[PDB]
Amino acid sequence: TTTQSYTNSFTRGVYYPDKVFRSSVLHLTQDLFLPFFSNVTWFHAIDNPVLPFNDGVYFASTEKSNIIRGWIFGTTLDSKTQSLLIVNNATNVFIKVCEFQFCNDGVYSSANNCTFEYVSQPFLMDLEGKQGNFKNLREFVFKNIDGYFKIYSKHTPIIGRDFPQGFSALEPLVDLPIGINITRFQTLLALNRADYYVGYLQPRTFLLKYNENGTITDAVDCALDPLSETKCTLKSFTVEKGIYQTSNFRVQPTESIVRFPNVTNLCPFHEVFNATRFASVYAWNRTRISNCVADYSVLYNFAPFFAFKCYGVSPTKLNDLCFTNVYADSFVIKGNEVSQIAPGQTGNIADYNYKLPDDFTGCVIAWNSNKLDSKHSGNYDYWYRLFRKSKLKPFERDISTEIYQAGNKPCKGKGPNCYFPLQSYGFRPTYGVGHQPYRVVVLSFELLHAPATVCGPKKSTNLVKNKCVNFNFNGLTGTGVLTKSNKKFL
């Protein structure tokens, strides 16, 4: 088990931002530093709780014996993802950065995949010094920089005083080149053969004073206190008596609002999904789109939409995406032809009546209509085509194909070795799944140079009152306060 004590870090956790020597310089830099006098939760483990790795978790330890190893960083730290380990032993680094499931401490359960490994020297730097309570001061900085996981170190001995107010400089060390993501962090204490200070480093400017020997003897924050900000602006550790203009204050925008016209175009998208007298597959309908509304709810909620597969454009990131014209074609097939509808595939209907090209962008939608386009004793209104010379070209109509011929012999009508391609399509309300009349529409996306006026609801949001917000009135982007006016707008 472990405790949940809360303390103050004071001034601590200052590292070298770069690898350039500075002597007697007051160089000022902004990076992921530990804010001065920032409260750090200190756990005393005699366990191993979870900690979110947000913006550079910092660590420290003031133990009395070697009990703490195993730094892990990953999303949820388990569940088949890359979580890594920095478990150490007093021979070498014992880096165990791989993909695991459970380790509890090398010591692991499932090998899975793996990545960068490296051993050169004990990463914990297990030296006892002189006194028993050398505390093996475990100052390190772990942070993510464009995927370059950085690690620092400083083994400055302390005497009893945990989180001491004495200054220290964290020298850099090796860094992990793994381009992975990190969300949480836990310390996997080692297995047998005053230890925790998670000072999260929020980004903030820091003023650092270098010795004549290049060591960082002292530093001051730039946003902790007004005096610290004044010193930061003056680039000196001493300020004379007087008034100093440090920075500027603004009220940050509480909320962001987006406004747009009434979005009232009223495309008959519901009307093209309920026109009862549909057209068969041999003569598929076609519509032209312009100045419409891209209300995709009907595509999403109306009808069971048995078919929703598409390969060109995601049907999720589509409400805001906006074109001008869409080629939608409506026809009725059975269950299996709905599946056979695809780009670059075989299938009698798809090969002889309506072919989807390989470069087709769009989403094919089919739902179940078992009682609308069907009736008892027979539904012979629906037709289809079955024969042609070869593979049909995409987006092609072959109405009035006369009579199909074979055998290299002249034929006059429906007779021997010459039949009518329009074979009967019998529809009854008692077909089982695979032969039930299924209504499918194929609507295609084209990256059109024409003005795209069908863009969706435009995300109209209520606009507060008397509050500093980011407004987007009819595309007017800006930040300010909003209030009722007494203007005389024309």
Binding site: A406, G407, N417, Y419, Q423, S424, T430, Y431, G432, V433
Partner: protein
């Protein structure tokens, strides 16, 4: 250009049009199973007449295509199924006389009535006769009834059987086949495949070797049956000799289910009777169907369609609209299936429900195939798979798993022997007779025998093969084994024989691959995804490919297997071996009960 493309186009057109017309005619047939009204039956006969006319017209169009210029195996199978013309190969007069004689056969078999010495009792065909047979053991009564029925039916049928053999070998010549037996065997014709082609005489060799390997075991079981009969009639059976024909067990010599009260080894202990358990639980036919679907899901078969539970009749809708409830359930086409039962809450109704559930599942499996191959690879696959479903339901292990049987039940050797004897004697009594008539039809239509060597050889062969002696000698003008409903309209018993052997093979392979332990019998095949996929990979094929490849996938061998007969009755046979020391072995052909 090439005839293959023309055959393909026709085949597509024929398949579409004939699937539409077959859906219409199957709707008519289902409404025939449901209603019996005159307007209904007029619609049904007009629909079937138009379907027959369409089929004949398409066959006439397809007669143009040749036979040599086809290379695809599926196209070859489609051509073989299509080229079957039947009665259309003859002339109009021959067709009209054939249909007239079929009508005469149907009328005489439907209206056949035999009069006892008292004319007040009119034995109306099989109903009544079967009840008297089952509930009475009167030698004089049953023998007189059978003798009169034979002396009438065979006397009327003798010249028409010669007419039939002549006409049927003429049809065989029209099909360019050696005989009508070979014409039937054309359903087992494999051509165009190396190391995979099997001709018609291969089946004759297979039945010969099966007879060779079943002769001793059949002799043993027949000896046990005749000993059981002797224990109830001591002066009516010759133990060293064969058993008379009128003592097979039933009215036609077909079934042996009647020999149940005097044949059970331990009649004192009751058999597996769960009927009381579902009477306690108040089970329903719909819930029994749901349990069958759950079992089929355990064997990984696809779920039944919603239309199956929506449209299909399940329970009787009153008594004014009477329904026939013979066990049969065929698809309507385009993925529609329905079922008809006279269901109650018993064991046999559940057994036939599982049988037709296997039927419907097999029918659904091949639904992606075209119309000409929309059938089993033989004429008994659906019946065989229904039987294996029923046997899977019959095992008490399935009852224990389902919970209908109380868990505190102990399996006993005598109970196992009783169940195996019942489920054996119900089917195996038909096995000697089915080939006893099938081989005789084969040889008669062969043309290798004269006219006046039929009845004597009939009786002598059945005695010397199974132990079936004629009690009342008859001359060559009789047709005693031709008084069955199945032979009324020239239906082969090849389907029954292949059903009996194939269902065995299926269940033996399934139990072998189901990691079972102990005796193969009394073992269910459920909750086994591997074996379910093993079923499905051949169920989805159907008529498209010959049975041999599916057989090698299911079991591992290419020819017919003889092991199931031996290894399906192993406890019965092991128990009988020790008792055989006190029972005489063998039969004498020359001994007949009326030679005094």
């Amino acid at each position: 250009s090439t005839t293959e493309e023309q055959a393909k186009t026709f085949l597509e057109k024929f398949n579409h049009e004939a699937e539409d017309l077959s859906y219409q005619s199957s709707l008519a047939s289902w409404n025939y199973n449901t209603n019996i009204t005159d307007e209904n039956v007029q619609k049904m006969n007009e629909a079937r007449a138009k379907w027959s006319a369409f089929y004949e017209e398409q066959s006439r169009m397809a007669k143009t295509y040749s036979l040599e210029e086809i290379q695809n195996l599926t196209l070859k199978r489609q051509l073989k199924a299509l080229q079957h013309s039947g009665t259309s190969a003859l002339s109009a007069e021959k067709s009209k006389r054939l249909n007239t004689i079929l009508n005469k056969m149907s009328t005489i078999y439907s209206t056949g009535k035999v009069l006892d010495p008292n004319t007040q009792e009119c034995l109306a065909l099989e109903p009544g006769l079967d009840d008297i047979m089952e509930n009475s053991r009167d030698y004089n009564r049953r023998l007189w009834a059978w003798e009169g029925w034979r002396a009438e039916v065979g006397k009327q049928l003798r010249p028409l059987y010669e007419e039939y053999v002549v006409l049927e070998n003429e049809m065989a010549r029209a099909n360019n086949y050696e005989d009508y037996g070979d014409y039937w065997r054309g359903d087992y014709e494999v051509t165009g495949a190396g190391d995979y082609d099997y001709s018609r005489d291969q089946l004759m060799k297979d039945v010969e070797r099966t007879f060779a390997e079943i002769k001793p075991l059949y002799e043993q079981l027949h000896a046990y049956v005749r000993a059981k009969l002797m224990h109830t009639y001591p002066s009516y059976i010759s133990p060293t000799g064969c058993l008379p024909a009128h003592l097979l067990g039933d009215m036609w010599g077909r079934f042996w289910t009647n020999l149940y009260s005097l044949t059970v080894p331990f009649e004192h202990k009751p058999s597996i009777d769960v009927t009381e358990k579902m009477e306690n639980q108040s089970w329903d036919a719909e819930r029994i169907f749901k349990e069958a679907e759950k079992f089929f899901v355990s064997i990984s078969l696809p779920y039944m369609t919603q239309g199956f539970w929506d449209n299909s009749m399940l329970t009787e809708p009153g008594d004014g609209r009477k329904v026939v409830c013979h066990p049969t359930a065929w698809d309507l086409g385009k993925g529609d299936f329905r079922i008809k039962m006279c269901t109650k809450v018993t064991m046999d109704d559940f057994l036939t429900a599982h049988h037709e559930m296997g039927h419907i599942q097999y029918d659904m499996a091949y639904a992606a195939q075209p119309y000409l191959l929309r059938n089993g690879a033989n004429e008994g696959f659906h019946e065989a798979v229904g039987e294996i479903m029923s046997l899977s339901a019959a095992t008490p292990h399935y009852l224990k798993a389902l919970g209908l049987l109380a868990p505190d039940f102990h399996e006993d050797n005598e109970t196992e022997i009783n169940f195996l004897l019942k489920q054996a004697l119900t089917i195996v009594g038909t096995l000697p007779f089915t080939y006893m008539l099938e081989k005789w039809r084969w040889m008669v239509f062969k043309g290798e025998i004269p006219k006046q060597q039929w009845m004597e050889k009939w009786w002598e062969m059945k005695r010397e093969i199974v132990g079936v002696v004629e009690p009342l000698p008859h001359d060559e003008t009789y047709c005693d084994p031709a008084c069955l409903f199945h032979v009324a309209e020239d239906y082969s018993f090849i389907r029954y024989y292949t059903r009996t052997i194939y269902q065995f093979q299926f269940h033996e392979a399934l139990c072998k691959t189901a990691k079972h332990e102990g005796a193969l019998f009394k073992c269910d095949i459920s909750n086994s995804t591997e074996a379910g996929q093993r079923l499905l990979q051949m169920l989805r094929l159907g008529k498209s490919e010959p049975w041999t490849l599916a057989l090698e996938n299911i079991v591992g061998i290419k020819t017919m297997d003889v092991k199931p007969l031996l290894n399906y009755f192993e406890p019965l046979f092991t128990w009988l071996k020790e008792q055989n020391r006190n029972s005489f072995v063998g039969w004498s052909t020359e001994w007949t009960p009326y030679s005094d």
